[model samples]
Target: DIQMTQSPSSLSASVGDRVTITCQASQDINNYLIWYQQKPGQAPKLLIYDASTLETGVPSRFSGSGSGTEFTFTISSLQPEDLATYYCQQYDNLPYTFGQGTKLEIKR
Candidate 1:
């Protein structure tokens, strides 16, 4: 099974700032990486999958890309409502693994 590691753990940014996060896989996962967003007390919402494919209904501001053992997730324009924790998950292995998560907070 593969494991994923996300960097920075947490960040604080303004509403219009661009946010970027990274994920590294324990082993090559091809393009089976998925990114998700979760708000307090809510289930995670899928944002990107297959490394860079945007999920249906997801905003254009969110994007990701990478292959093999590395991946990235970017938010072109951050919004106040975007405050949440982001996660990276790998689906290529029998026991799926996820990153520790990156929490995004709206800067005052």
Candidate 2:
């Protein structure tokens, strides 16, 4: 199974600020990487799939890229409603794995 590791488990930012999160895989995942955003008491919402394809309904400001073992997710302009925990998951192997998570907080 592939393992995913995310950096800067948490971050502080304000609206209009650009923030990025990184995710690394234990092995080459081709492009089966998926990104999701989870809000309190809500199910995770898909953000990107196949590495860089943005999902429908997701704002253009959200994006992802990178192949094989390295990947990244970025928010070009943070929005207050975007405050949530972000996670990366890999489907390249059985028993899919997910990154610990990156908690994004809005700076007051």
Candidate 3:
């Protein structure tokens, strides 16, 4: 819908530490609220969309919800790899981009 929010601001962590974060719509509009993890790639990782759907092949610990549109996220199984290149860096009040198309999206 519109208006979004998230938590775990200025967070730091070790492997498998209780990493909890959340997102919320500005009001009671529960349709497709897309959340993303700002990572360096061609695109940002899709945390959820159309409510409580992990589009990315996230880990089992990656838990998210959108009922009542209070979108909350609890991630588990942290990896040192997340910090290898950089730590949590980087949305919306933001605009979504036209993603790459198919294998050309990947092949690129």
Candidate 4:
């Protein structure tokens, strides 16, 4: 199983501010990676799959990039509804691992 770690446990962003979360894989996993966003008391929603492919119904502002040991998840323009915790997961094998997560908060 691969382990993933995310930076900046929490971030502050305004309505249109760009948000980015970095994920580092414990080992190489080719290009098989997925990203998810979770809100309070809600299941995580898939945002990016296969590294950079945007999942259906996800906003255009949300994007992901990278392969192997390094990956990045980005939100081009955050909205009030986008306030949530974002995580990255690796689908390379059984017992998939997820990034710790980064919480996006509304800027003061």
TM-score of each model, paired residue for residue: 0.94, 0.95, 0.60, 0.94
How should the candidates be ordered by lDDT, best one leading? Answer: 2, 1, 4, 3
lDDT of 3: 0.46
- Comparing candidate 1 with candidate 4, which one achieves the higher TM-score? 1
CA lDDT scores, all candidates in order: 0.88, 0.89, 0.46, 0.87
lDDT of 3 by residue, 1-108 (tens): 244455434456567664555555555554455545555564656655555666757556566666544655555655654331111111233343312211100110
Off by over 4 Å in 1: none
Model 2, residue pairs in steric clash: none
Least accurate 10 contiguous residues by lDDT in model 2: 94-103
List of clashing residue pairs for candidate 4: none
Q: How does candidate 3 fare on TM-score? A: 0.60
| RMSD to true structure for each model, in Å | 1.0, 0.9, 9.5, 1.0
What's the true lDDT of residue 88 in model 1? 91
Better candidate number, 1 or 2, judged by TM-score: 2
Please count the clashing residue pairs in each candidate, in the order shown: 0, 0, 0, 0
Across 16-96, the per-residue lDDT of candidate 4 in tens digits comes to 999988888888889899998888798998889988999889889988999988898888998999988888889887789
